[PDB]
Design a protein around this motif. Structure first.
Motif, short mmCIF file in Angstrom:
data_model
loop_
_atom_site.label_atom_id
_atom_site.label_comp_id
_atom_site.label_asym_id
_atom_site.label_seq_id
_atom_site.Cartn_x
_atom_site.Cartn_y
_atom_site.Cartn_z
N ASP A 33 56.41 34.88 32.58
CA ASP A 33 55.66 34.86 31.32
C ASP A 33 56.09 33.70 30.40
O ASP A 33 55.44 33.44 29.40
CB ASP A 33 55.89 36.14 30.55
CG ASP A 33 55.36 37.34 31.26
OD1 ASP A 33 54.48 37.19 32.15
OD2 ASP A 33 55.74 38.48 30.95
N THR B 119 58.81 33.66 28.53
CA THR B 119 59.22 34.28 27.26
C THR B 119 60.69 34.60 27.24
O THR B 119 61.29 34.92 28.27
CB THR B 119 58.49 35.55 27.00
OG1 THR B 119 58.69 36.46 28.10
CG2 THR B 119 57.00 35.32 26.85
N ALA C 275 59.48 27.77 20.37
CA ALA C 275 58.35 28.61 20.75
C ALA C 275 57.04 28.05 20.21
O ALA C 275 56.98 27.65 19.04
CB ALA C 275 58.57 30.01 20.21
N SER D 204 51.12 31.44 15.89
CA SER D 204 51.32 30.19 16.57
C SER D 204 51.37 29.09 15.50
O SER D 204 50.99 27.94 15.76
CB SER D 204 50.17 29.93 17.56
OG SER D 204 50.09 30.94 18.56
N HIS E 95 57.34 32.86 22.96
CA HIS E 95 56.51 32.24 23.99
C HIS E 95 56.91 30.77 24.01
O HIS E 95 56.52 30.04 23.13
CB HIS E 95 55.04 32.47 23.67
CG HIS E 95 54.68 33.92 23.48
ND1 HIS E 95 54.20 34.69 24.52
CD2 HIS E 95 54.70 34.71 22.38
CE1 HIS E 95 53.97 35.92 24.06
NE2 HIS E 95 54.25 35.96 22.77
#
Length: 207
Positions: free
Chosen positions: A70, A72, A129, A149, A173
């Motif tokens: 992922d 992450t 991230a 984000s 992320h």
């Protein structure tokens, strides 16, 4: 899903973190572990006079969970958690004022690694991230997911993802060029370098 604007000062902080050339990105981990420790300290204190505060989980600890599929890195604690109002209000921080101090300091010779000294260390997550999701559960509220984000906005929604009992989970992320922070050797090194004296167990999960 509700969408909110970051206060202008916080948007500006985030953009500075994202756009400034600064190589010592690894400090993000210490900042988030420090925040976890602070939260664990808060539930511990409340439990001293009301043991029922731990009905939602008596173990006080921090887990670091990398997932290469992922892309992450997740930091989980069983601290006090945050209410929906705390989430909206800059994740329980006084970020507006902290940002002003940090920016003045950056002018008096500070650097980005000092961000935690201004109470806005959470935002260092944006060093590594592209998106951050915060899942949180406080004894006085339901489980919520915050996400952003950057770009000036964040969202908040209820989370019927796995119930967590109590605490906060910060899911990073990672940017494509920041996958070193998923490697066991690297995470171990950063924890030893900057988080050696934290008063709760820090478990690095294996893949």
């Amino acid at each position: 899903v509700e969408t909110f604007a970051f206060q202008a000062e916080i948007a500006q902080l985030m953009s500075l973190i994202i756009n400034t050339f600064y190589s010592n990105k690894e400090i993000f981990l210490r900042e988030l572990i420090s925040n976890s420790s602070d939260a664990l300290d808060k539930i511990r204190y409340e439990s001293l006079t009301d043991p029922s505060k731990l009905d939602s989980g008596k173990e006080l600890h921090i887990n670091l969970i990398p997932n290469k599929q992922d892309r992450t890195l997740t930091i989980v604690d069983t601290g006090i958690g945050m209410t929906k109002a705390d989430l909206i209000n800059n994740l329980g921080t006084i970020a507006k004022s902290g940002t002003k101090a940090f920016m003045e300091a950056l002018q008096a010779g500070a650097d980005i690694s000092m961000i935690g000294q201004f109470g806005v260390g959470f935002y260092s997550a944006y060093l590594v991230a592209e998106k951050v999701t915060v899942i949180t559960k406080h004894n006085d509220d339901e489980q919520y997911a915050w996400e952003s984000s950057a770009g000036g906005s964040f969202t908040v929604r209820t989370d019927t993802g796995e119930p967590m009992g109590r605490g906060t989970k910060v899911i990073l992320h990672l940017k494509e060029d920041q996958t070193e922070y998923l490697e066991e050797r690297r995470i171990k090194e950063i924890v030893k370098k900057h988080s050696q004296f934290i008063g709760y167990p820090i478990t690095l999960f294996v893949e």
